[PDB]
Amino acid sequence: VVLHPTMLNCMRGLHKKAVLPEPVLDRGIELARAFVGGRRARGQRVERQPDVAAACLMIAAEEAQQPLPLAEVRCLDSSLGDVELRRADIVRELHLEDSERRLRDTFADNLLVKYILKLGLQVSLYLPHCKRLLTALGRVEALAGLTVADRVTTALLLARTAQTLSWEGMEAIYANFSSKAHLEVTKVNKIMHLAVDVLPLIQAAFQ
The missing domain is CATH 1.10.472.10 (Cyclin-like)
Known part of the structure; x- marks a missing residue:
């Protein structure tokens, strides 16, 4: 062919x-x-x-x-x-279909790991935490409509910048993440501003 x-x-x-x-x-x-x-x-x-x-x-x-x-x-x-x-x-x-269902179930973890490695961060610290952040984000009404990738981005950047690990330059961090991830910095700003506004709701879902 x-x-x-x-x-x-x-x-x-x-x-x-x-x-x-x-x-x-x-x-x-x-x-x-x-x-x-x-x-x-x-x-x-x-x-x-x-x-x-x-x-x-x-x-x-x-x-x-x-x-x-x-x-x-x-x-x-x-x-x-x-x-x-x-x-x-x-x-x-x-x-x-059977393979695609497996891909969908592992997509979030594998993207987290990918971004964690790209940011020079420690997988064994960030992965299980950001996984829990991910679950929390899905139970926040104001965040419905975020894609899986948006939630992965949010969970990682929250873990990196919002001291969410204690639940158990800023523009320069988002910009660096955005370049390394090949994402639009303006879209990342928007998703983060939305998540940061509802921060206490994410926490209550997390805790």
């Missing part, structure tokens, strides 16, 4: 900017060939090839427990569209 140049170029470019391991790209290529080969054999149009590429890469990255959240994908390539729809299409047509 020969993939369209735009499909390959997008995947290679995004994989490069994400600083992902080589065999993740190879897995991304394999998923795309199978999906594209499936569609071609049934006479189905392959729409939005760059988005299909991103989605294949994300499945691959999650399988290697090096998750690539959508917020990062949009920050690395601002032109990509409805990547989530394509991911659902791939999962369904390649029959990956």
Whole structure:
């Protein structure tokens, strides 16, 4: 199965900017060939090839427990569209429902670990704590609508800047995190301002 140049170029470019391991790209290529080969054999149009590429890469990255959240994908390539729809299409047509359910269950931990390692922080300290912060955040009404990735970002930055560990420059910290995570600093500011405003509610959920 020969993939369209735009499909390959997008995947290679995004994989490069994400600083992902080589065999993740190879897995991304394999998923795309199978999906594209499936569609071609049934006479189905392959729409939005760059988005299909991103989605294949994300499945691959999650399988290697090096998750690539959508917020990062949009920050690395601002032109990509409805990547989530394509991911659902791939999962369904390649029959990956059982694997996808496992990926969804481990996504939060694996992203936490990824960010903790990127920030030069100690996993054995931050992981079990930020995990508990994560659970707390989901029980806070004002924070409904935050994505899993938004909650991971919030839990880590709260643990790093809001002294939440005692429950058991600031712009420069958010900016450094944002660069290292390949996230939009303005989106991180917004999520944090929302979480910081409702700080005592997060604490009560935590305790």
